[PDB]
Write a protein that binds this ligand. Sequence first.
Ligand SMILES: Cc1cc2nc3c(=O)[nH]c(=O)nc-3n(C[C@H](O)[C@H](O)[C@H](O)COP(=O)(O)OP(=O)(O)OC[C@H]3O[C@@H](n4cnc5c(N)ncnc54)[C@H](O)[C@@H]3O)c2cc1C
Ligand SMILES: Cc1cc2nc3c(=O)[nH]c(=O)nc-3n(C[C@H](O)[C@H](O)[C@H](O)COP(=O)(O)OP(=O)(O)OC[C@H]3O[C@@H](n4cnc5c(N)ncnc54)[C@H](O)[C@@H]3O)c2cc1C
Ligand code: SF4
Ligand code: SF4
Ligand code: FES
Lengths: 276, 468
Amino acid sequence: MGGTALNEIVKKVKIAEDVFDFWIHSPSVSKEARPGQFVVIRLHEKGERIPLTVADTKPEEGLFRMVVKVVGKTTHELSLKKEGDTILDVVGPLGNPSEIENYGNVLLVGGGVGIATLYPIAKALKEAGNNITTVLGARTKDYLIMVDEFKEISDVLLVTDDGSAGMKGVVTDAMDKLFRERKFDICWAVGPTIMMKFCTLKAREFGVPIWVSLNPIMVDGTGMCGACRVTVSGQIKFACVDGPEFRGEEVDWDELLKRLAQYREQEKISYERFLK
Amino acid sequence: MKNRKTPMKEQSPESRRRNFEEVALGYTLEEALEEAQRCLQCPTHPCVSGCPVEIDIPGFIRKLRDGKLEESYRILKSYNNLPAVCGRVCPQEVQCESRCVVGKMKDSEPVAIGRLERFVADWAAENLEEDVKPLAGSKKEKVAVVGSGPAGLTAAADLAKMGYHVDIFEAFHKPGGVLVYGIPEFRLPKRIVEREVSYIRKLGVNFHLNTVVGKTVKVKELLSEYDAVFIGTGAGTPKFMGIPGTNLNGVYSANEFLTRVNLMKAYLFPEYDTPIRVGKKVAVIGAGNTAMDAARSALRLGAEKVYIVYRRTEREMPARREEYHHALEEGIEFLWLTLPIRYIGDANGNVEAMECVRMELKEADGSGRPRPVPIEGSNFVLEVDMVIEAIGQGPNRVLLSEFPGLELNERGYIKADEDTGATSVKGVFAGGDIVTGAATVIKAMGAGKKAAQFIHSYLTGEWNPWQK
Ligand SMILES: Cc1cc2nc3c(=O)[nH]c(=O)nc-3n(C[C@H](O)[C@H](O)[C@H](O)COP(=O)(O)OP(=O)(O)OC[C@H]3O[C@@H](n4cnc5c(N)ncnc54)[C@H](O)[C@@H]3O)c2cc1C
Ligand SMILES: Cc1cc2nc3c(=O)[nH]c(=O)nc-3n(C[C@H](O)[C@H](O)[C@H](O)COP(=O)(O)OP(=O)(O)OC[C@H]3O[C@@H](n4cnc5c(N)ncnc54)[C@H](O)[C@@H]3O)c2cc1C
Ligand code: SF4
Ligand code: SF4
Ligand code: FES
């Protein structure tokens, strides 16, 4: 009837070898979402619920942005979903909103897709009155790149990749290379668990407090099961309810990735999917 | 000397051990009629005193005997919104059939009231339907129902029949509460839940699925835009014992296990995309129906041994007797007076063991059931590759905090009038497991019916519980 639909994919654009930037219509998620929150989705009736971060919102047009990396069937399937196709189930906004306010100077770090889940927080700080600096890292030398445009706008840019525009080794080498500046106040680390962990461990160099966004296996994302278990300081926390954002100093990090490797199947679902 | 219940067709144990199809297959008409003859039509009908909503038992049994099956169904439905559910899941052994006279006889079993409620409800299902006409939207006023369990479904239905605009709000993609993601298909076929939801759909009740209230929509909006509100969200928040090794791979909340298994159908994989962990020796902690379903489900997933681990004995166990019998017939093993102390894992990632002890009869009651006291030197181990905790669960205290002036009890459940369901907040009603703590489907049903009637009494101005 010349209009849109509920979960319609309003835009799908590729930005890396396996990463996709979707814009999707959902007035509830668009209106209600605050930074640091996420949605759980299902693509079809045989689908699984999967967690993804709301990376931006256009409440006026009722859109929310979503960035997906293809590791298995579901993300692949959504990456294969054409513009106009609907996602069957969209649940959100979920999780505890980030803590935003006018602070001093701020440093942020993002690896892989976490960058896109890092942006919305970064965006909120700046409109809160902060002055930021950002460090971006990638998973390999040539292909699998990073978001060119969005961050440079928010602040001065630092790159870490076997290749262009910056250093080579790791994001933690880029940190500690502020030995000169040393900065102050807070930090943020989002990406693979290992990275965020070592970003925490780089509370050693600057004696800095590091915030972190955790990424465990989720099912409901509403707090009704506890698949997404997390040990904070000493106590069990649910990342979908109490998080996903915690203080890296408190997070049990080995426990997490020792639990992310819990279903070493989907080896299977991914293979069955990848047939023409 | 004996007088037994008319036996029902059931799946064969060896074949049914592997599948999720319904185990109790249901009466034929002649079997049902043959059972209905055992009812002695007691004028004082003690049976009725064992039913929480007080179903006119001998009545629907009578009209069944007479061959007037719709009349039987009509008699049932004027009391119970969910008969096909309740006749299947009610623990008649602690309810209606525990008061049945024919069981008072020596070596004699009570009338099978539940199987008959089921039969009548099922017989009417695959035969007749009703007028498709929607009844909602006549009384012009708005009532919101949060949660689509027995309580919300019941309230919503009954309100739609009363002419009101009913908007249901559900967190999940499927409605039915525990009836969809808790109790498995081998106990409660989901055709029945879908049937009842559809029925309620045709009444003009609009369902908001995948809608988590407080997030998708703010409580304040819900309060502003609706004349009344019913809260039927249950007690679904899991708690872990918190012993060492709770964080091992292979360790599950029954909520997660049963959510994956029942809702996401992880036993149907890679058909459905949700995976489930392999374990041949699984331990289920608890002796509730939760533990029984989780165990019996794990068994159907191809586990070789399944253990029930209970701090108490067989005679304290709160499980449905029929299903415990089935559980035994399917090969579940039981550890009476057993309590885990820690879970143990290996180098890569696994549960590999569980340390346990034996308990004493010493302490008297003191919450729970008579507080078992651990015995020394009885300490032993169970070797397990998967652990599921079915120790119970509590209310969504967070969502409750978002209701200003809403009073909670000692354990955090809502305070509401026993008969009307009205709570401390004006225009807000509540019922089901979110008030009482974990109980029965029939009680959630009943709570919803009464809350609905007093929503009606409220929105008509006849009765107002909220003043200064
Ligand atoms: C708060 C939170 C925010 C997230 N935001 C994003 C995002 O913005 N963009 C993005 O691409 N991903 C994000 N993820 C991770 C995303 O959920 C996983 O990539 C996704 O679950 C896997 O999709 P799949 O198609 O591979 O499904 P599946 O077929 O079930 O998974 C296949 C592989 O995914 C691995 N995996 C890693 N984490 C998970 C997980 N939570 N659930 C299931 N499988 C997992 C598994 O080890 C498995 O091997 C987020 C996770 C969390 C907890
Ligand atoms: C494993 C298990 C086995 C059981 N076996 C039996 C049995 O054999 N016999 C018996 O009599 N009883 C049994 N019960 C108990 C019975 O199922 C429950 O008492 C009954 O489901 C409670 O009904 P309810 O509507 O009050 O709450 P629930 O059914 O628990 O929950 C209903 C709805 O509330 C929704 N909800 C919660 N929060 C929100 C929110 N913010 N927004 C939107 N929706 C929300 C949920 O999505 C859910 O759909 C069992 C329970 C469990 C867990
Ligand atoms: S008690 Fe047993 S016999 Fe007497 S009415 Fe109830 S069912 Fe029929
Ligand atoms: S509802 Fe439960 S208790 Fe009441 S009669 Fe039917 S089965 Fe017996
Ligand atoms: S994912 Fe089930 S509780 Fe957070």
